[PDB]
Design a protein around this ligand. Structure first.
Ligand code: W1U
Ligand code: W1U
Lengths: 306, 306
C-alpha cells in the first residue's frame, strides 16, 4: 500500500541526452537514431531573442557551427533543418542506446515524467500534469531547455514534451517533439502570460479512489447526486465539467472499491463546500488533481516496464 | 524556478536489478560485481514466515535452489551466504553495468530515491525521507521486496536502503545494504508497530527558504526569536528540537535570501500557532518536511550527475 507521486524509470531517456552548443548558448538535445532534436532558440544570441527571424538566423549557420557532445565524445553534424520550433541536427552516428519510441502529443489532464537536464547531463526526474491552460508546473533553471517529458508503455518510450521557457507566474511552456507548442505561446521574449487555469475534476476523483484503496474513508458519505447537480457545483469552484466518458473511465476504480462514481462526486461536493476541517487525504491538505485514473490503477496494482 | 519532489535519475540502478526466485517466493535482487543482494526472507514459505529460524532454513538450501534472472538471462549461483537480514548470492558473471557505488547508512531526516521494482523490472521512481521513527512513507505492493533506495554523488551511487515489509499503519520498514534494519523491526510476522513520529524541523525551514527563493513571501515577518524560545514552541507541536548545527547548515540558504535563520524560525512559530489561513506554500497547504537543506540548494542551483 501507499501512494506517491511516481515517475517512470528514466534510464531509457538518459541514454539519449546530449549537449548542443551554438555560439555562447548551450542547451540539451535528444539523440535518437542519427538525429539530435533541440529547441531552435539555441541559434539565437541575447539580442536575437527579442524578436528573431529564425529562418533568417538558420540560413546564416552551417553544420560546423553546431557542437554536439554525447558525454565526452563529440558528434559530427552532417545536416540541419528546422521543424516548427525544434532543430533536427543530422549526425554521422546513430545512437546505439536508441529505445523503441514514438512522438505523441498529449491532452490537458494527462501526466508524464520530466527528466531535467543541464549540459546534457540528467539532474533529476519528476511527474507533471499538462494543465488545462497548457502550462506545466515544473522545476527548470537556466540551461534546462531541451529536457523532455515522456511516458513508458512496456518497452516503448512515448516522448510528449520538450522544454523551452518559463512564464511570468513561474510556470513552464514547451512543445511536443514535432516542435508545436502546447498552448498559445511563442519562443520569443514577449509579454505572454499563462491564462486562467481550472482543476482537473476527473483526476481529483481518481485520487479520492486511491485514498479509499489506501484506507482513508473519512470523507465518504451516504448521499448521492446526479451528474448535472454535481456539475453545477464544479462550475462554482472552478472545477472543469465531468462527462459521461469520465464516469465510464472511473468504472474500474468504482468496481474495486464498491463506491459508485456519482457517490464519490457527492463526497467531492461536500469537500468543496466544507473544506477538510483540519484533516488530510493521502498526506495532503488540498484536493490533488495530478493523478489520472490510469496512474491510480498502475500504482495500486503494480505494473512494470521492460 | 519552481520546486518539485525530485528523484535522482534511476538508470544506473535499473541496470543492477534482477529477479530472485526460491520455491514459490519471488522478489528483487541487486546485482553488483559477481554478487546478488536480496532480502533473506526469500527462503521462507508461508508457514515459515511466522517465527522462522533463518540459519536453519538456509543450511537446508543449496545453490541450485536459487533461480536468479537478469532480464531474459539466467544467472548461475555458485555460492550463497547470509549477512544479517540479506542474502549474498555469488553468481558466475560480474554485472557489466556495475556503477561506482558505496554502501552507506543514513540518518533520520535525510532523503533518498526509491526505484520500486516487481519481478526484477523497475516500475517507478520517487523521493523518500527516513522518518525520525525509522520508517518510510513509500508505495510498495506484494513482490516489491528487494527494491532499493539510493543517492547519487557525481557518478557514484550510495545505496542506503533495501525494502522488506509494510507495518500496520501502511508505512514501510527495511535495512541498509549490510542487512541491518532501520529501527526496531524484525523480518518476521509479529505485532510490531511504527512508534510515534515527529516533524523534521530543519527540513521545514529549508523548504521555507525554497519558497522564498521561488517568490512565496507572505509568511515572512519582522519579528525574531531566540533559539531557546523557538524550541519551546517546537516541543509543543511535536517538532524536533533545532540545534546550533542546524542553524549553521541553514547558513548558505540564509545568506542567499537575506533572512536570518532565527527570523525564519519566528515565521515558522507564527505558522504553527495560526496555521495558514487558507493560503498555500509551494503548492502545499501543509508544512513540508521531506526536503533537506542540500535538496533545496541542489534544486534551486542546478547540480547534475555523470
Ligand atoms: C532554456 O534553457 C530556458 C529555460 C528557462 C530559464 C529559466 N527557467 C526556464 O524554464 N529558456 C529561456 O531562457 C527562454 C528563451 C526564449 C525567450 C528565447 C524563449 N526565456 C525565458 O524562459 N524567459 C525570459 C523570461 C523567462 C525567464 C524566467 C525566469 C528566469 C529567466 C528567464
Ligand atoms: C516483500 O515483497 C513484502 C513487501 C510488502 C507486501 C505489501 N507491502 C509491502 O511493503 N514483504 C512482506 O510481505 C513481509 C514479509 C515478512 C513477514 C517475512 C517480513 N510481510 C509484510 O510486509 N506484511 C505481513 C503484514 C504486512 C502486509 C501489509 C499489507 C499487505 C500485505 C502484507
Amino acid at each position: 500500500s501507499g501512494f506517491r507521486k511516481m515517475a517512470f524509470p528514466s534510464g531509457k531517456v538518459e541514454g539519449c541526452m546530449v549537449q548542443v552548443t551554438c555560439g555562447t548558448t548551450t542547451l540539451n538535445g535528444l539523440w535518437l537514431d542519427d538525429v539530435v532534436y533541440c529547441p531552435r532558440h539555441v541559434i539565437c544570441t541575447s539580442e536575437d531573442m527579442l524578436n528573431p527571424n529564425y529562418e533568417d538566423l538558420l540560413i546564416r549557420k552551417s553544420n560546423h557551427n553546431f557542437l554536439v557532445q554525447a558525454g565526452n565524445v563529440q558528434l559530427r553534424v552532417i545536416g540541419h533543418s528546422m521543424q516548427n520550433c525544434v532543430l533536427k541536427l543530422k549526425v554521422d552516428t546513430a545512437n546505439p542506446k536508441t529505445p523503441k519510441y514514438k512522438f505523441v502529443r498529449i491532452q490537458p489532464g494527462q501526466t508524464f515524467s520530466v527528466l531535467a537536464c543541464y549540459n546534457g547531463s540528467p539532474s533529476g526526474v519528476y511527474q507533471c500534469a499538462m494543465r488545462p491552460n497548457f502550462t506545466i508546473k515544473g522545476s527548470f533553471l537556466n540551461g534546462s531547455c531541451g529536457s523532455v517529458g515522456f511516458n513508458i508503455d512496456y518497452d516503448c518510450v512515448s516522448f510528449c514534451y520538450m522544454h523551452h521557457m518559463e512564464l511570468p507566474t513561474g510556470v513552464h511552456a514547451g512543445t511536443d517533439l514535432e516542435g508545436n507548442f502546447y498552448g498559445p505561446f511563442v519562443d520569443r521574449q514577449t509579454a505572454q502570460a499563462a491564462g486562467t487555469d481550472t482543476t482537473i475534476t476527473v483526476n481529483v476523483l481518481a485520487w479520492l479512489y486511491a485514498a479509499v484503496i489506501n484506507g482513508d474513508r473519512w470523507f465518504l458519505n451516504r448521499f448521492t447526486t446526479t451528474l448535472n447537480d454535481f456539475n453545477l457545483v464544479a462550475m462554482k469552484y472552478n472545477y472543469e465539467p465531468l462527462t459521461q466518458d469520465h464516469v465510464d473511465i472511473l468504472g474500474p476504480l468504482s468496481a474495486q472499491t464498491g463506491i459508485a462514481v456519482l457517490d464519490m462526486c457527492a463526497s467531492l461536493k461536500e469537500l468543496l463546500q466544507n473544506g477538510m476541517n483540519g484533516r488530510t487525504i493521502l498526506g495532503s491538505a488540498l484536493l490533488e488533481d495530478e493523478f489520472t485514473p490510469f496512474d491510480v490503477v498502475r500504482q495500486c496494482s503494480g505494473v512494470t516496464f521492460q
